[PDB]
């Protein structure tokens, strides 16, 4: 009939179709410092524990 399937008046909403970036990270600089500090402090604590065990 006169009522036919189609877009509503004014058209549909605009939609994104391109890739969205995602900058989710702890960073290159931060991770190295965190791991190195963990290594140093952990080795110090391991030495303390070894002293107590001795």
């Amino acid at each position: 009939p006169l009522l036919q399937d189609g877009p509503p008046p004014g058209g549909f909403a605009p939609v994104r179709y391109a890739r969205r970036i995602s900058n989710t990270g702890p960073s290159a600089m931060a991770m190295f410092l965190a791991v190195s500090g963990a290594f140093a402090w952990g080795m110090y604590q391991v030495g303390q524990g070894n002293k107590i065990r001795r």
Binding site: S22, T24, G25, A28, M29, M31, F32
Partner: protein
């Protein structure tokens, strides 16, 4: 290139920073609602145009709509329909044999859209798996039983596409 860039891309090579980004996505999908359905209890959505099990309809007075015109048999691309007809005692044009090979049927709906009296339709039923081959050789009695069993749903669907067909 830059020492900063070399350091940045060497850290990402060693710290597996492009795999943590995939682990995070998989984990985020771990804590999420599932989209699986309990098939025996809840069924997937369908459409009124769905082409399932065939059914032969009859008039509300109790007379079968099929007039043995063989117009569905000539359009069937799979040659799955065989019709035998003769003049009934009242002189009406009716079928004596109307059998459909469900093992040849391709469920295209050409027979449904070629019937001039809406006698043969494809109902919403899709759960009719059989344990034997010749139980899939539907005949006139089986098709009429299908039509009587699915009459209300078939009528509602045909009412729905009255605006489209």
């Amino acid at each position: 290139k830059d020492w900063n860039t070399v350091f940045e891309r060497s850290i990402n090579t060693l710290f597996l920073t492009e795999m943590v980004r995939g682990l995070s996505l998989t984990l985020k999908y771990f804590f999420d609602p599932k989209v699986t359905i309990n098939y025996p209890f809840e069924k997937g959505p369908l459409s009124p145009r769905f082409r399932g099990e065939h059914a032969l309809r009859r008039y509300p007075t109790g007379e079968e709509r099929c007039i043995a015109c063989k117009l569905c048999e000539a359009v069937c691309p799979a040659q799955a329909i065989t019709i035998e007809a003769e003049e009934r005692e009242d002189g009406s044009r009716r079928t004596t044999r109307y059998d459909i090979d469900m093992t040849k049927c391709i469920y295209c709906g050409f027979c449904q859209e070629a019937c001039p009296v809406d006698a043969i339709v494809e109902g919403p039923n899709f759960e009719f798996a059989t344990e034997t081959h010749e139980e899939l050789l539907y005949d006139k009695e089986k098709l009429l039983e299908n039509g009587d069993r699915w009459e209300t749903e078939i009528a509602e669907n045909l009412r729905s596409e009255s605006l489209y067909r």
